[PDB]
Structures are given as structure tokens and as C-alpha cells.
Design a protein around this ligand. Structure first.
Ligand SMILES: [Cu+2]
Length: 122
């Protein structure tokens, strides 16, 4: 009921698809950042929302800025998120799998960068 994901200095996540076993009551994403660049020029987060909500989450997050982890505080569209991390840093986020609803399309993404993938219930 966890996965390890990396974001590197080339604005790449090391996977584009996460699958969650339906047996999981909670699920944890462990984000790390190989590379040498710090958070103010190559910070990554891991953010989960519906596909429909992603644009607004990104737009509002970029308006909120670096010290808010490029996320709008208390954004109700964000199902789960990490903080923003630079190289060598780590953050984990856990969420309740019952938040993922039938028939919905979930995406994960980093808000400052063109980095995204899908999250699917198995
Ligand atoms: Cu990023």
C-alpha cells in the first residue's frame, strides 16, 4: 500500500502510472529527488486530484508561490499532496483510499513543472 517515486533535475518522474490495490485502506507515496539542484530552481511536489481539477490546482498553486509549496492553502480539490522538495530531500504523503470514487479519473502531478501521471484503483 505504498509506492516510491522520484523527480529528477530533468523534470521527470520515474513513473507515469500508480496503481492502488483495493485492499488498501490508506496508501502512501514516498517522494524523493535525485539530482543536484535545490528547491528554489528544481523543486518538485506530488499532488493528486481529479483530471478536471488539475488545471485549477496548478494555476492557483503557481499564484500561491514557493513558500506555499506552489499549492493554494486548503485547496479542496487536492486529495493528497507532498511538500515541495529539492535534491536529496524526501517527503511522504498518505491518503484514505475511499476518497477515490468509481468512474472518476485521477491524476498526479508536480505543480511547477510539466510532470504528470495517472493513479488508478486496481
Ligand atoms: Cu517538479
Amino acid at each position: 500500500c505504498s509506492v516510491d517515486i522520484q523527480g529528477n533535475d530533468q523534470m521527470q518522474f520515474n513513473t507515469n502510472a500508480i496503481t492502488v490495490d483495493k485492499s488498501c485502506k490508506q496508501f502512501t507515496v514516498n517522494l524523493s529527488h535525485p539530482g543536484n539542484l535545490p528547491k528554489n530552481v528544481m523543486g518538485h511536489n506530488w499532488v493528486l486530484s481529479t483530471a478536471a481539477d488539475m488545471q485549477g490546482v496548478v494555476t492557483d498553486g503557481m499564484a500561491s508561490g514557493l513558500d506555499k509549496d506552489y499549492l493554494k492553502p486548503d485547496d479542496s480539490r487536492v486529495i493528497a499532496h507532498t511538500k515541495l522538495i529539492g535534491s536529496g530531500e524526501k517527503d511522504s504523503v498518505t491518503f484514505d483510499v475511499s476518497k477515490l470514487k468509481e468512474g472518476e479519473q485521477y491524476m498526479f502531478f508536480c505543480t511547477p513543472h510539466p510532470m504528470k501521471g495517472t493513479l488508478t484503483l486496481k
